[PDB]
Design a protein around this motif. Structure first.
Motif, mmCIF file in Angstrom:
data_model
loop_
_atom_site.group_PDB
_atom_site.id
_atom_site.type_symbol
_atom_site.label_atom_id
_atom_site.label_comp_id
_atom_site.label_asym_id
_atom_site.label_seq_id
_atom_site.Cartn_x
_atom_site.Cartn_y
_atom_site.Cartn_z
ATOM 1 N N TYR A 1 -3.541 0.751 -4.785
ATOM 2 C CA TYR A 1 -4.356 -0.043 -3.881
ATOM 3 C C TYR A 1 -5.202 0.860 -2.989
ATOM 4 O O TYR A 1 -6.414 0.676 -2.869
ATOM 5 N N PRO B 1 -6.278 -8.193 -4.944
ATOM 6 C CA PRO B 1 -5.375 -8.526 -3.839
ATOM 7 C C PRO B 1 -5.296 -7.357 -2.858
ATOM 8 O O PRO B 1 -4.232 -6.776 -2.670
ATOM 9 N N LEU B 2 -6.430 -7.008 -2.260
ATOM 10 C CA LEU B 2 -6.522 -5.836 -1.394
ATOM 11 C C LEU B 2 -6.404 -6.287 0.057
ATOM 12 O O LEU B 2 -7.247 -7.027 0.559
ATOM 13 N N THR B 3 -5.334 -5.847 0.710
ATOM 14 C CA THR B 3 -5.000 -6.295 2.055
ATOM 15 C C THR B 3 -5.936 -5.731 3.124
ATOM 16 O O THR B 3 -6.224 -4.537 3.149
ATOM 17 N N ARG C 1 -7.975 0.781 6.901
ATOM 18 C CA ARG C 1 -8.954 0.595 5.821
ATOM 19 C C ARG C 1 -10.313 0.154 6.377
ATOM 20 O O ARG C 1 -11.362 0.698 6.007
ATOM 21 N N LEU D 1 6.414 -1.193 -2.364
ATOM 22 C CA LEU D 1 5.430 -0.540 -3.227
ATOM 23 C C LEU D 1 4.898 0.755 -2.599
ATOM 24 O O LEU D 1 4.736 0.836 -1.390
ATOM 25 N N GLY E 1 0.575 1.314 -0.706
ATOM 26 C CA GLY E 1 0.105 -0.011 -0.357
ATOM 27 C C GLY E 1 0.322 -0.328 1.105
ATOM 28 O O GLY E 1 0.857 0.480 1.863
ATOM 29 N N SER E 2 -0.093 -1.523 1.507
ATOM 30 C CA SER E 2 -0.066 -1.888 2.920
ATOM 31 C C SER E 2 1.334 -2.251 3.421
ATOM 32 O O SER E 2 1.599 -2.177 4.620
ATOM 33 N N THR E 3 2.223 -2.650 2.515
ATOM 34 C CA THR E 3 3.570 -3.046 2.922
ATOM 35 C C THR E 3 4.339 -1.811 3.382
ATOM 36 O O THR E 3 4.978 -1.822 4.439
ATOM 37 N N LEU F 1 7.783 -7.377 -0.747
ATOM 38 C CA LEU F 1 6.458 -7.527 -1.324
ATOM 39 C C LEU F 1 5.731 -8.716 -0.727
ATOM 40 O O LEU F 1 6.322 -9.540 -0.027
ATOM 41 N N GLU F 2 4.440 -8.811 -1.003
ATOM 42 C CA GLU F 2 3.636 -9.895 -0.426
ATOM 43 C C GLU F 2 3.980 -11.307 -0.958
ATOM 44 O O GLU F 2 4.197 -11.512 -2.146
ATOM 45 N N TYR G 1 -6.157 -11.101 2.085
ATOM 46 C CA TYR G 1 -6.929 -10.248 1.182
ATOM 47 C C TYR G 1 -8.423 -10.419 1.432
ATOM 48 O O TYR G 1 -8.894 -11.533 1.694
#
Ligand SMILES: C=CCSC[C@H]1Nc2cc(Cl)c(S(N)(=O)=O)cc2S(=O)(=O)N1
Ligand SMILES: C=CCSC[C@H]1Nc2cc(Cl)c(S(N)(=O)=O)cc2S(=O)(=O)N1
Ligand SMILES: N[C@@H](CCC(=O)O)C(=O)O
Ligand SMILES: N[C@@H](CCC(=O)O)C(=O)O
Ligand SMILES: [Zn+2]
Ligand SMILES: [Zn+2]
Ligand SMILES: [Zn+2]
Lengths: 258, 258
Positions: B58, B86-88, B93, B135, B138-140, B189-190, B217
């Protein structure tokens, strides 16, 4: 320069403190948007003055005169520098003003007096015993006016031609109508307001059914304004640091009366 | 020119088609983001090529080198014109790329093997028999790494130090790990992905607890890109006409296997 903030009296976003007459400037007001403004301004490093929008409206463009009213109008015509309010992000508005990413989520929803025989928009559309309307001059009204979906166009067709008018000038007016009509009126309003009122005495209304759409409120600034960048970043920061969720619970649920 | 769209294989946003072994170009793929790209490109009037991000990530910034990887890197370094995935939307960012208004909402959530004795993140934090992770890139992950919240900080302290690692390279890896760990692994996860998987054979996982945060997203473009404006307005339009809700139901619940 001190930033002029336009906002609107709408519980629990912005309310007069029980003792405002003895207080001045920003100190007169309290609520979710009052708390947010202080935080936005602190992080963006500006001084500000809260001012209640003159015509008590959110913002709509008069068909024919093409003049914008409400908070949107005050940004478009240069009266305010920024709007911090439950102002819905919409396409027609995005065309004439700038919105930050959403600070709160909502969908159009249905408020009934408890025990009202209604579960959904489809339900409302299939009958005539129970009247239903929306706020004036707002995104909810436009949703119905512009909708191409079956259930929704039928509802608009009914609402636009109902007499007496099913539209209200204020959220409070709508809630009072639900409360006084013995189940014969339902009110279409944003989920956030619906959920707040559900938690308030006399505890006689409730949100029913799923939301009709999905969107959010954004902080708005005049198109091209330099403020936009900072304010948007501040919203993301505050969101990530958990401030928004904190404020939501503070003003909706922590207060809960039901 | 032909727009180079960067995206990522992630169900049900972008997936290889069955018949797969017979198609070329964009035609190879199906999914929510595949449908969304077509619509966006229609309304903005451009032609495009879907490209699967080279490194399968991501996007995050290497502390030490400060280089962005993933779909984020592809925009920052000029390899792609737009990201549709699905880009948070996040603060770090947004500082280097532009995002449209959100096209879908989500929050971080917990996936368990059915019957696992866990109901909340607090539950996870208070115990050790059941391992848990997120993950990579990623953002999480960043959520937990940067969390000041008591429960989440304790979870991060555990996660960053666990051995064997509790981090996974892809969502599919995370999900296979829950499924084969006999309840001894929970995956963070999301909610969107969690809910999709929950409705897919073998129907052995489930989402438990509420979402840990609220975000969304966005379609991303390189900072100051001209495309950004049209894209944003296209998302708003699509939202208001119900296409986004249409797509969501098509790819999540119309599919339903459980
Ligand atoms: C003026 C609007 C700014 S935000 C628009 C909005 N659109 C939608 C649409 C859908 Cl269908 C969904 S959902 N329910 O599929 O997740 C979410 C959103 S949004 O809240 O992210 N933004
Ligand atoms: C897309 C870029 C930034 S979105 C950040 C986000 N913040 C929140 C926070 C809350 Cl507490 C709520 S909620 N649950 O109170 O409605 C909603 C949002 S958001 O989705 O509008 N945007
Ligand atoms: N939030 C709405 C007003 C309330 C409503 O229409 O339900 C707006 O910005 O117009
Ligand atoms: N949507 C996330 C990836 C999934 C996750 O981190 O859980 C991102 O944009 O980084
Ligand atoms: Zn193949
Ligand atoms: Zn279309
Ligand atoms: Zn490194």
């Amino acid at each position: 320069k001190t930033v002029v903030v336009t906002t609107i009296l709408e519980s629990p976003y912005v309310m007069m403190k029980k003792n405002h007459e003895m207080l001045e400037g920003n100190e007169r007001y309290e609520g979710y948007c009052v708390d947010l403004a202080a935080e936005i301004a602190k992080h963006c490093g500006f001084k500000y003055k809260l001012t209640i929008v003159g015509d008590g409206k959110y913002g709509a463009r008069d068909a024919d005169t093409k003049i914008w009213n409400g908070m949107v109008g005050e940004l478009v015509y240069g009266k305010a520098d920024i709007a911090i309010a439950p102002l819905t992000i919409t396409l027609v508005r995005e065309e004439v003003i700038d919105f930050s990413k959403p600070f709160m989520s909502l969908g159009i929803s249905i408020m009934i007096k408890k025990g009202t025989p209604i579960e959904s928009a489809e339900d409302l559309s299939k009958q005539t015993e129970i009247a239903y309307g929306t706020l004036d001059s707002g995104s909810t009204k436009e949703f119905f006016r512009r909708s191409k979906i079956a259930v929704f166009d039928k509802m608009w067709t009914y609402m636009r031609s109902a007499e007496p008018s099913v539209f209200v000038r204020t959220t409070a007016e709508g809630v009072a109508r639900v409360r006084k009509s013995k189940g014969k009126y339902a009110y279409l309003l944003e989920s956030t307001m619906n959920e707040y009122i559900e938690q308030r005495k006399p505890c006689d209304t409730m949100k029913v059914g799923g939301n009709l759409d999905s969107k959010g409120y954004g902080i708005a600034t005049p198109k091209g304004s330099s403020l936009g960048n900072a304010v948007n970043l501040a919203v993301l920061k505050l969101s990530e640091q958990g401030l928004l969720d904190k404020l939501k619970n503070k003003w909706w649920y922590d207060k809960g009366e039901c």
